[PDB]
Scaffold this active site. Sequence first.
Site: not given
Ligand SMILES: [Cl-]
Length: 162
Positions: A11, A20, A32, A104, A117
């Site tokens: 970051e 950003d 943010l 985050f 995933s």
């Molecule tokens: Cl996925």
Amino acid sequence: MNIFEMLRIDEGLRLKIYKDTEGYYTIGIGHLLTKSPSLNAAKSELDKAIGRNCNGVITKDEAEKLFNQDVDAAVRGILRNAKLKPVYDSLDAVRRCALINMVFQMGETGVAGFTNSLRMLQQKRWAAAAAALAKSRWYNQTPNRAKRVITTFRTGTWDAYK
Ligand SMILES: [Cl-]
Ligand SMILES: [Cl-]
Ligand SMILES: [Cl-]
């Protein structure tokens, strides 16, 4: 290497408002402020968070305080999340950092939508998980970061950050 060090690399540390990577007003270590295009709103958002009249500029110590709260907010969100908890519980310490990294950056909801995933990670199908993650807008927008996070998930080591 730890989560804080890990996120500080990803970051950076900026002591003055900033846009950003997507227009957004931000400051510190990826804090943010607002999705609104008003410097004014951001400027006000900054004050309410610091608790003072900051005039769009903060100190290191302040940025660090914000960072401590955000990481805590991230871990606690994951732990409260019906979708994220089980995944988290199932992982080794390194990969858990990777999950924290993502939350985050994109919020609980954002990460919660990486269904496939997530399932793959829970199954310990590393390589498959890395390919799915790669097919995302996230990857295309912030490819280098995305890759560091993906390798971390694939390998279980901190190599990508060494
Ligand atoms: Cl996925
Ligand atoms: Cl894609
Ligand atoms: Cl990047």
